[PDB]
């Protein structure tokens, strides 16, 4: 029902993160290059849950990168 986006940051290159979308049980973005700052990262995230997911989403990612995106915005159910 919701569109999953997930924003972790890459164990290989601490400080950079990457965006995973997850629509209808197939991952339609994988491992996307998202930034090398928490700002950076959430933008990508906001773009994602706005081009992808269609009507809900659900953004979950670092507290760093959540805090650019206020606490109203990062999930829409």
């Known amino acids: 029902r919701p569109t999953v986006v997930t924003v972790t940051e890459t164990p290989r ?3 950079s993160y990457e965006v995973n979308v997850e629509r209808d049980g197939k991952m339609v973005v994988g491992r996307a ?3 090398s700052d928490p700002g950076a990262a959430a933008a990508k995230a906001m773009q994602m849950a706005m081009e992808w997911g269609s009507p809900n989403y659900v953004i979950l990612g670092s507290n760093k990168v959540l ?3 206020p606490e109203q ?3 829409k159910m």
């Open 13 to 15: 290159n601490p400080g």
């Open 67 to 69: 805090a650019f995106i």
């Open 73 to 75: 915005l990062r999930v």
């Open 33 to 35: 290059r998202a930034g």
